[PDB]
Design a protein around this nucleic acid. Sequence first.
RNA 1: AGAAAUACGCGUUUUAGAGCUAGAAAUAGCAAGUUAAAAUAAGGCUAGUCCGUUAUCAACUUGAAAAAGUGGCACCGAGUCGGUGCUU
DNA 2: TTGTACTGTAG
DNA 3: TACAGTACAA
Length: 1148
Amino acid sequence: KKYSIGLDIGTNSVGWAVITDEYKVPSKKFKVLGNTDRHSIKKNLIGALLFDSGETAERTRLKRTARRRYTRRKNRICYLQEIFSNEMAKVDDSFFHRLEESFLVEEDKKHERHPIFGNIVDEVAYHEKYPTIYHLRKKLVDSTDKADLRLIYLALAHMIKFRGHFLIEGDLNPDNSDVDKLFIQLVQTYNQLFEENPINASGVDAKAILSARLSKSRRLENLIAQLPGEKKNGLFGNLIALSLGLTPNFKSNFDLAEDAKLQLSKDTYDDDLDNLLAQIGDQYADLFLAAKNLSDAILLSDILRVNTEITKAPLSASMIKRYDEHHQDLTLLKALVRQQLPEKYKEIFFDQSKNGYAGYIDGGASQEEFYKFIKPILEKMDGTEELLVKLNREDLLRKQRTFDNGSIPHQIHLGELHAILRRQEDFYPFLKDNREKIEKILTFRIPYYVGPLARGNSRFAWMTRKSEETITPWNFEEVVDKGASAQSFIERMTNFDKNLPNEKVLPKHSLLYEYFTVYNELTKVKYVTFLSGEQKKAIVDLLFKTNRKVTVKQLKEDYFKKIECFDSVEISGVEDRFNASLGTYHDLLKIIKDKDFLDNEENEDILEDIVLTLTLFEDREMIEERLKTYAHLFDDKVMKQLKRRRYTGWGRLSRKLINGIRDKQSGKTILDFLKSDGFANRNFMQLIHDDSLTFKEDIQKAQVSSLHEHIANLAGSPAIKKGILQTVKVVDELVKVMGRHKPENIVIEMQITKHVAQILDSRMNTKYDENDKLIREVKVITLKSKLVSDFRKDFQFYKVREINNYHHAHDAYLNAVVGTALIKKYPKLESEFVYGIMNFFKPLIETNGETGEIVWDKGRDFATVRKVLSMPQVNIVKKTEVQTGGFSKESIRPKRNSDKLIARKKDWDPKKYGGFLWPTVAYSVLVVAKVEKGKSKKLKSVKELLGITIMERSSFEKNPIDFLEAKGYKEVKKDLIIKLPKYSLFELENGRKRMLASAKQLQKGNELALPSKYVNFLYLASHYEKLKGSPEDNEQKQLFVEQHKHYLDEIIEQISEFSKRVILADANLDKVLSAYNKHRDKPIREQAENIIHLFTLTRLGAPRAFKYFDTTIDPKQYRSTKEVLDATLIHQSITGLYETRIDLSQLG
RNA sequence: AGAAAUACGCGUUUUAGAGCUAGAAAUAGCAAGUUAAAAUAAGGCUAGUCCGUUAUCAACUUGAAAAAGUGGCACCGAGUCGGUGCUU
DNA sequence: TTGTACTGTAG
DNA sequence: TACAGTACAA
């Protein structure tokens, strides 16, 4: 009658088991549908559901963003062509069409093959006169004669398309571009953080060292030699190193156990920086982005070598000079190789595969790979001294389109564009009429607070229009309602506090947030000669509001000796210094310099609105609008300074916590308790946890604000959200199985915010009374994994991950057993364990104590649990998933005559244009039909699977019949079409099971049910000297493992039986048997660890390459789905108890 | 603890950038190389400077869909579950 | 002309 | 880890 369900929720697995009050798993005869002979199967109420991990939105957001960038870039080109078209049509009628169709082959091209002029002589003349685009750009800047209109378009389109970055706001000035200025800014912020032992740099000339044409490392050592107090391995040297790009290490600076690689030029630098500042705190982030902008300045200086001259456009002239140096160096290298080392000349300049110059240009070799190939050649060669030093400084044979161009601000391209539009202004009137239009095309950037320029059909947009017309950069300022868009931006990008929802979160740079973290840091301090309120106020007013960094030595020298007259004070609450600080307070104090205004409690809301404004917005305009209200408090000299300061990040707590709700008896908020708490000071989470105060009850009553509609608003990690949803479906189906009877109690695995117990309690308990707020029909019991792991450890019920996935179901059943025993043994800890200690397991018969009911015997319950742990039939279910995502791999392969290449566009034949490969199959489809085979055409019937990929999924689901007819299948029987997703289960002879991984790939789907004594012996054979228990238990397991050495031979016999039954890998079987026989005399450690990896051959899933002692066994791949056309297809529910077996041999 | 807004620079693919000489040639010697256009998930319709890789999904019967419904129990055993006995 | 085996590939 | 490319058995 009464029964319990245990669960074990994981990221990739959900275990489940049904127990009775006698700790026995029931077994029932389940009905099975389908056309098969079987009508009822005996199955057990224990099993596990296995599924792929849920992915985060991150990659999808990245591709979405990149796709938006591509669309907006193409729209910029469309705007420029729309400007040029009316005049260009009189000069060249088919110029834009030739640019559009330049991709196509000459056969598919309606116009001439030459894009720019359409005549070969003029094209050759163009490429002789301007070998790069930068030559044309520099001429158009530096020529006063009338130029061709199409060349002007090419230059303007080139710098509008590749327009550089927007990181520097306003005009370009030496205050944020000249390397000395941001170097002084870096030393100022470094001294601001490290107030103690400052580093001074006044007589140094940073443009002399950092902009010098020398090697990077020697520049680092020269700069260190200019600073006697520092070393190259020091923190300042490390900062200068990653400003230069040497990939330095921060582990030595902070005694980190793990290495601390950081590089700005890496493909993704934000992530390792994020972990690094998670380890050391966020105060240093000012120093890191100061180093990043110093790197931007250094790179911008080195690519602009013609910065010494104001006689030309800098970028174009420098790039021309780079081309000239590349040419005159390449000809020298060619001659010197051809004369002084004639062998391997063809390997360098002809081969185009071995990272030579031909591999540098015509192959896929980077700059540093080419350098690493050529530096040994130059070292063996002679006369290369002047050439090798360029490679040492990475200035040898550089290209014009490299990764270093990401430092170029958009102001340089804007200046070149303005110079061209002013040099050609009088010659073309439509350039004079549209100069501001073209400059607005280049310089317009959609604000962060506007987002997608949609019209209600976007999940992501929030922008509110003031008119209904097309948005262009020219009329953006008079169409979008910036106030309403900014307000909606505020309402959407804010997070909400987890402890108290519906509440606006404070910024992490908020003033009261810094007050909270300072006070929570400071109230847990004890001094020996706990603080009182006046002492805390004096310390904060004297030290925290005077310097950012407060150490123990400053506090004992400046407060107790100066004010309290205490000579010797011992402090134990804080070790060396106070990690939290009033950074925002001192920043604003530096800005306005009106300190008593900051000390007034009436100004808390206005200052909080100011910091909220700079936390939300990054662009200048709405920042200016939002605090233009406060211009009558103080004047422009501070306005122009606080309009440029920006904050980033958000806190975890809301204002309604800190100085919000109030205690009924004490009359004090959280922060009011942090002001004074009597003798025994108590912390924030201690104030929450204390049940005497009404704070906890106020938190819990305000916590509350179809099944899928109830999931559609949930919060938490995306990987475990899948686990909660699947465990809800599993619990629902298990209730459905046993005659709709609800369990007596449900045990949930784990301090951890288990909202899953709240969900299950809400779904099971749906009844209430006028006096009882909720009836506890089902008691969701929450247990920690420490208890069950200890229970496995001490009573010899061990487990491994490598043998089979029975450990999930075994864990779930053990959770159920320990939870039921715990609630039944101590009923008074029910409120402790049910939402809303080990020693009794080890008298030989235990009782309830208050009642005569028997809760645990050390007799037949141990035999029952050992039988269940040794019980072979466990319902392991792999969730059948329709594959979604990108329909192919993103690499674009060259042209070939294969028909397997996927077309990159509708009109682009992949035989001539290349295309993608490796498509992803969403699901497979069983078809029976007739296929026209043979030269003498007859109709042969055939039954075979066909893979429907993600790209053809929609075209298949609109109308399958003509989609199958387009593939050659005719006379298709429509009713026999069976959709087969991934991990579809098939059963063959001798109980052999195969899981459908694709249309042409199978997987192992059988389970090795190894007995419990063998798994105990295999666990005990491993971990030979790392139990860390007691010496007597240690030696107990040593003799236990040594006198049963025949168990390994019995176990390998078990593998040789099981893999001969269902795996059918005979060659690998002979390899493992030979390697076991010839490595039989090795000790138990290596033998045990390698037989633990030996189960990879028989593990369910894809065949993976395991390894023995020395030999490595290649996997046996099942690249043939021909055997499942006559197998028995199994349709398993989420628990696998209900099945529908379809015999495919009776079809077709 | 998730989710979202704005941009950059690469990279890949095809084409354009006239290759020369000896050549019956399968080819050999020499010269040259740095750039640009276009696409960057096929595409979709409410046609927006929007959307298209996250989440969700065993089978069958109703239902456009949403969604709802469909599968006896006890005992003895265990190689992926089997057997025995009542019941409609 | 159709299946298997081994190695390489993948923003 | 499924798919691609090349190399053999019939």
